[PDB]
Amino acid sequence: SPSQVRQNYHQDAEAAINRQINLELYASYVYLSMSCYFDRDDVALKNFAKYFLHQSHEEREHAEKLMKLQNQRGGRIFLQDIKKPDRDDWESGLNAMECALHLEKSVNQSLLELHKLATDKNDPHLCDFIETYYLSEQVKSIKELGDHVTNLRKMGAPEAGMAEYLFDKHTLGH
Amino acid sequence: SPSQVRQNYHQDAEAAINRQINLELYASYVYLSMSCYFDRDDVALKNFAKYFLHQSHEEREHAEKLMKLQNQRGGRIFLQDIKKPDRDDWESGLNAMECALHLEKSVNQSLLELHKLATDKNDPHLCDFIETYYLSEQVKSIKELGDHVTNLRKMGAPEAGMAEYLFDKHTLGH
Amino acid sequence: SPSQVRQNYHQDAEAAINRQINLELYASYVYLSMSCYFDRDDVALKNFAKYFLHQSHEEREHAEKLMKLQNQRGGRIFLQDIKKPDRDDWESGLNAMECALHLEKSVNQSLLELHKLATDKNDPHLCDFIETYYLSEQVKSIKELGDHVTNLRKMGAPEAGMAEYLFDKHTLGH
Amino acid sequence: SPSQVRQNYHQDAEAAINRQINLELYASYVYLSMSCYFDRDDVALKNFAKYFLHQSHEEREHAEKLMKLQNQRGGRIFLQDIKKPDRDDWESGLNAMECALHLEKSVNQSLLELHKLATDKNDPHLCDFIETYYLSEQVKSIKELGDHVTNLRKMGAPEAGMAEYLFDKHTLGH
Amino acid sequence: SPSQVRQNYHQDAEAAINRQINLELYASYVYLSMSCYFDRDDVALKNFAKYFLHQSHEEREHAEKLMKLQNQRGGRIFLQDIKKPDRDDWESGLNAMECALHLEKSVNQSLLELHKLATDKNDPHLCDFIETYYLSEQVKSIKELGDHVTNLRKMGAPEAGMAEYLFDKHTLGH
Amino acid sequence: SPSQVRQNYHQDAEAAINRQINLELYASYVYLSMSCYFDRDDVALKNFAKYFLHQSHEEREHAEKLMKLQNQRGGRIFLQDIKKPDRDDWESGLNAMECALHLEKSVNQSLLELHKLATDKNDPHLCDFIETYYLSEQVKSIKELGDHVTNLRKMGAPEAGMAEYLFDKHTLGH
Ligand SMILES: [Fe+3]
Ligand SMILES: [Fe+3]
Ligand SMILES: [Fe+3]
Ligand SMILES: [K+]
Ligand SMILES: [K+]
Ligand SMILES: [K+]
Ligand SMILES: [K+]
Ligand SMILES: [K+]
Ligand SMILES: [K+]
Ligand SMILES: [Mg+2]
Ligand SMILES: [Mg+2]
Ligand SMILES: [Mg+2]
Ligand SMILES: [Mg+2]
Ligand SMILES: [Mg+2]
Ligand SMILES: [Mg+2]
Ligand SMILES: [Mg+2]
Ligand SMILES: [Mg+2]
Ligand SMILES: [Mg+2]
């Protein structure tokens, strides 16, 4: 008994969209963990915390947009557990940026697999949705994170004590 | 003797674009018929008539955009008869919404076949045009019509006399 | 079983109004064909295309006003096929203007026959509607088209290459 | 090795705050599931979906405020899995409101246990935080949900088809 | 040793992007040559010169956007010589427009080959970038140039002395 | 067959102006290469990239002003290949600034030779043009680049990791 709006929407695509929803929610949760780490009194990097809180909210928005797509196409959303992040302690601004880069590249790889599936199922609307709202955003975010990692490494983080402080002020405070 | 601007524009794509122009014009004409049905003194649902008149004008705009694409790519527009709609009497707001949903899904299926043809002919500009201006609009319209059908059915239309009146006021009057 | 609003509205007038609706829709379609002809890369007269697109939209508005009259008087709208225009290629700005003049005079003749019928059936409201909204507009349009034809002919169109270019800039660009 | 800011902050309170963070995140996730249910084409109650999306965002904000408290007091945030909601299909607006009322009363009971623990540990700052930011908000939300449930039941939901439609327009659309 | 941001970016695509950068820079240089030709005291067509200077700056912007893409994806930009244009003397406004049309169609063919390569390498981000920022712009520019060529030819350029003067005033001066 | 506007404009000066046009275009291309180097994810100095992009655009403007002079005096512009820059990798902000200083001093030496030629040919208009639009600008740019080199060296660039980061923020970010 398919939805009255469903058209050219393969069941495999519906399942993959549900998986991507869970992945975006997990990414939001990871970014939230990082943000709270930098709010610690013994870390105390306010702009790192703000940066990762903003990333967390953006990932949640991505998840919600995918749910809207799922309903728009007549798919049915099936939520799963949002697993806790791998770490409680992210150990430095540089390490958190590197972990964020790894996470964003994993999310991008998932979106590329999703696009490959949509191409295989001849779903141009789903392909276009992924390209328009996800792929370019992912490439921009990956480039920005790589830039941050490069600058933190060059400045001497985490060993150079002033590196993360000044990067927090100059790059993330503006 | 091809057009001086023609490049990577297959004759099959040109023909399919002409067919799609006729289909959009036909859809506009169907929506016009519906709008006039709800303007009848014995139907008298002003916001249904306004909704379908707006849909008719939008379909005409879609047709004109396709003609602009045809000229932009060096194709030649060949117009055909615009067939009269299948019905003169659309019998209820719920029935007209259901017929509109059927029509929009048929138009979407035609656009998906058109996109498949453009992909087969390796015409990325035509593919991108269809995705950007037609596919997402079609999915949005299909979802909106499905929502209207669901609400009208739940409210008890057409048997429940106040259903279409109140839906006209609350959903289509805002 | 006549409409509850029907009064002094002869069946012959209702049928003639339906025929006039089809004629106005056909005129709109002819003007659309002309507009698209002047959008061709090998014709490329933007203001001719704009002029005829505006005429097409005006004719559609005339058709819709007639449908509103049909419902207002308790008549029932019966749509027919909108026949494709006689030509795909309109061959020049002067030729398109001459064809438009011929079309507008045919539409005017139909409206005059309609007014004669309304007078014969003693339908003063229908007579007044035709006079107020259609007859003066038709005479103005016929005079404007005749003026355009005269100017294009005097300038040397279509043989004089700059004639249609300069007429497009000066008369239709302002 | 306690935090340099830690003062009068019992380990039991820290653990209970972590549990409350997980509960608020779970509540946000439940509300998100409800919001997406009402976005379905076969449910199509836009203002119910908006109401529950707003509730989801508010619960996330509550979770984040608790994390800020945890860091402010020198506690350490330990995140856990966010369990998926008990249902995918919430079956009606009335049922979703009743489930939301049950959820909010469970969250309130958890906050009351948390306040009892803070009183037992003589932590007036934590007590005041719970009272100021959580208890009154919970009582207001519980009262609002009870009001919605009462009105939906009186209107005849879900059996009365127009009940949830009109409640969506009048109570949740303003 | 790939870039830390590189993902799903084939070496062939990187090389093709470098080639496209050189092609856009070359196109900018050709347009600059044309602009300077129309600034000559013995040609003296100011709006032709302005048109081609604007085209030159636009092509440079296209090149810079491609370089930004190359860095964003982790590719490495390798610049090559920018070859001088084929002509110093462009001989007339009509001839320059025809040469510009030929150049733009060659650039479009290169972008279509680039899109084919990206499709073959399953690089949806690169495909979408080409479609979004290059393909539609190319089709629009080709259509505009074809229109200019048609109008100049019809007006009698270059033999008709007033043709290019009046086209410079009316089409390129507005 | 000299130009109708040509007066007191030696052929040697015309040739030297053509050479200077090529040199300015080459300088613009070198600055573009530098700008793109600092946009790399593994360099990631945004304000260095902005500084050199601005320099590239300024050099292009200088080239265009020279072409305007060439036409104004009745000379004929003859474009040549724009050679690729000597390096793809500029290795550091300090090294790029030093290379830019070397380039600007070479351009200044060329302009001084050009002024010497114009003085020898008794061309006061060309002399005044070089003095007014080129010589003072060159001295200002050379002084600014020398200042940047001095500051980067004193700060410890490139060995001191924070040197180029902070110089990018403080000197080039304001
Ligand atoms: Fe500083
Ligand atoms: Fe009501
Ligand atoms: Fe004129
Ligand atoms: K730590
Ligand atoms: K009926
Ligand atoms: K023709
Ligand atoms: K249900
Ligand atoms: K010449
Ligand atoms: K390097
Ligand atoms: Mg995301
Ligand atoms: Mg696309
Ligand atoms: Mg349409
Ligand atoms: Mg008319
Ligand atoms: Mg709460
Ligand atoms: Mg108190
Ligand atoms: Mg270009
Ligand atoms: Mg210079
Ligand atoms: Mg002087």
Question: Key terms for this structure?
Answer:
binds potassium ion; 174 residues; 72% helix; 6 chains; part of a larger assembly; cryo-EM; mainly alpha; oxidoreductase; binds magnesium ion; binds fe (iii) ion; Ferritin
Topology of this structure?
The structure is cut from a larger assembly and holds six copies of chain A (174 residues).
Chain A: H1 11-38, H2 46-72, H3 93-120, H4 124-155, H5 161-170
The complex binds fe (iii) ion (3 copies), potassium ion (6 copies) and magnesium ion (MG) (9 copies).
Describe the structure.
Chain A contains 5 helices and no strands. Chain A has 174 residues and is mainly alpha-helical. Chain A has one domain (11-171): Ferritin (Up-down Bundle). Chain A is elongated and about 60 Å long. At the C-E interface, helix 5 of C face helix 4 and helix 5 of E. The complex binds fe (iii) ion (FE) (3 copies), potassium ion (K) (6 copies) and magnesium ion (MG) (9 copies). One potassium ion is lined by residues 89, 91 of chain B. Residues 89, 91 of chain D line the site of one potassium ion. It is classed as oxidoreductase. The entry lists the keywords cryo-EM, mouse, heavy-chain apoferritin, Mus musculus, oxidoreductase. The entry is titled "Cryo-EM structure of mouse heavy-chain apoferritin resolved at 1.51 Angstroms".
